[PDB]
Design a protein around this ligand. Structure first.
Ligand SMILES: [Ca+2]
Ligand SMILES: [Ca+2]
Lengths: 219, 219, 219, 219
């Protein structure tokens, strides 16, 4: 039976039947958004949903026999597995983000269809080339996030009261979002020199971010 | 008469007479902006407008004889037809955006003058090579737009109440416009971890957009 | 005396003396900022300034005889002429921006030092190759600015009431500054579809500017 | 003993021990953030901290005997000295920013581990190629900062009242942060033409920065 089903699984139909299902469950998940719609056809799609999930667990079971060890060394397959595993955790108990993480299965459209995979892989491949940069930056963030907490957290604890808060704020200043009128001018009303912290912070971080872009243009 | 008019239409004079009309109607539409101006010369320019609109239909009628099917397979020609047709729809009934879209005819200065034609085409040509990225992105948006609506739409409906609102709001976060002080800091006031949803969204979406720019710096 | 002064003017010393003056009057203009300082040395500086202006006119007088027609065909020389001319208009009569445009003379530091001339010229040279783009864009702005004035100026005249206002507002949307929370969300409170006008505006204008940057990173 | 210690200092184990301490002290510093933690194990940390600082002076003492003049001509070594020196200044008292500046020692993780060194150096090298451009920009800023102070500082002293303030504000406009709704629309409420000052400022400054980015991609 091994070769029987290995012929079912690798068939253009089977794979095209799944891709057909992704687009249906995605269309169906957009419909689950409407508080009105759910009032009419809520049960249609609750069942239809549990239905697709079985189909999806069946496939992943089928796909493993056919691939064995090869399946758990393929990123895309591991993925498909975890995105379905998530989709199996009961509609109850624990945390309920897991209910919302069920929508992550529409990322199977990225998996099941190549080209997307071409492009996604294309994107991801640039990440190893960025890790030296990313690492640098994280040290830098880490250091300043610390200074800022102990420089501004007493008067300004929403923004800097905690190490994590400073991180967040720093992220915001880095994305250059409301940084002056929102954060640094306020800070200066108490600490006239805070500009001395934040203007330099902006330079290094914009410079770094620029360099990283010119580097992704090194290919 | 075919060859008569094919030599009328294809003449430098014809084209340059139209181009003379574009820059005149365009000047005249800037003039229709002023509530003052309209109180003196509103009559001049409403009639002048109907005049230019005839001239433009006459031209388009003529241009079709000279080209036949060749005309309805030219992008630039179709346009002028569509934009003139828009400018034909009466000044009453239906919606009023059709009145306002009349100003779209000034895009004939792009259509009826080369180099512009070159440049626009140069731009558009880059699009097909973005279509894999653009597509990737639209899935991602679609996914998160769904997640957000069911995570925040109860307490924060203006921003996330409806799928369409989540899209808009997400766009705004992507353009990085008031994302922290406007949306995410507020959101965290009720859902402390919302930072866990939006910072990641920011990285990917910003990354993706970076790749797309380096890609355009490939062709 | 012609060859006498052509040897005075073309001297390293002549130029280095002027350059010495630029840095001093610039230093002195940074000093004229203090309401305090003017109260202790206002006259020292008012006279020093009137002094340097002569020194610069004497130079321009000399420089012209030494160059004749060659002078009014050198950009840089014309500049220094017009910049110094501005600096000649009296303190009392006319517009008072003219008093402020005097500080434009510090741009002579750009004019009198060749290494700067290199870079400034480097910058400017890219502009001709953007004129095809810059034009495209100006047409676009012109058309939309017209559309917006007639779509929003009745309920929202501050942002859109006048042809020029829309330009300003559109610019702000384009620099992507508070476009959503500042303008488009408000606008949607009356005209639900304004999102239909402004998102597409953002795409084109963002796209175009990407192309223009990729184009410069081509030349 | 010279060769004794030269074989101690240059040892892989020596290098590994210090890098061990950096990751420990940086971890140590993150914990120093919690007002909770400090009440519990504050003592543990302040002594371990003084301990590490001893170790670090000893290392630099040893390292100099082993390099003599060679040390104070190495950028990275100077840094380590100047950073540890900062950490040497007692817990009192004049400026307490000196206490905060202690955390700068975590940049030794940048210093003691190569590849980081590789990358940082890569970043720094681009600076010389921007200095004509950075200079250009600084003169430009300097000139406008003066004009703005004298054009708006009477009515808008918070933003423009002082040379330094104009600098801050201009920087804010340049980073393109809240520039319209925060500054220029206001300004215009009193001085209708301020748009004539800031739009042009924005073009140049945006252009130059773009040029500087393309200039970087050149190297
Ligand atoms: Ca902003
Ligand atoms: Ca803002």
């Amino acid at each position: 039976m091994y070769l029987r089903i290995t012929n079912i699984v690798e068939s253009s139909f089977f794979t095209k039947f799944i891709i057909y299902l992704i687009v249906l469950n995605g269309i169906t998940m957009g419909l689950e958004t409407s508080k009105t719609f759910m009032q009419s056809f809520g049960v249609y799609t609750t069942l239809f949903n549990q239905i697709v999930i079985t189909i999806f667990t069946i496939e992943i079971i089928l796909r493993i026999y056919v691939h064995r060890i090869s399946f758990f060394k393929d990123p895309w397959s591991l993925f498909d597995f975890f995105v379905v595993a998530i989709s199996l955790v009961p509609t109850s108990s624990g945390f309920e983000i897991l209910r919302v993480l069920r929508v992550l299965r529409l990322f199977r459209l990225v998996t099941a269809v190549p080209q997307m995979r071409k492009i996604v892989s294309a994107l991801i491949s640039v990440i190893p080339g960025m890790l030296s940069v990313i690492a640098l930056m994280t040290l830098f963030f880490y250091i300043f996030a610390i200074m800022a907490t102990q420089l501004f957290g007493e008067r300004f604890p929403e923004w800097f009261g905690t190490l994590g808060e400073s991180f967040y704020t720093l992220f915001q200043v880095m994305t250059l979002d409301d940084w002056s009128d929102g954060i640094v001018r306020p800070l200066m009303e108490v600490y006239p020199y805070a500009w001395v912290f934040f203007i330099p912070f902006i330079f290094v971080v914009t410079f770094v971010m620029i360099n990283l872009v010119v580097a992704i243009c090194v290919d």
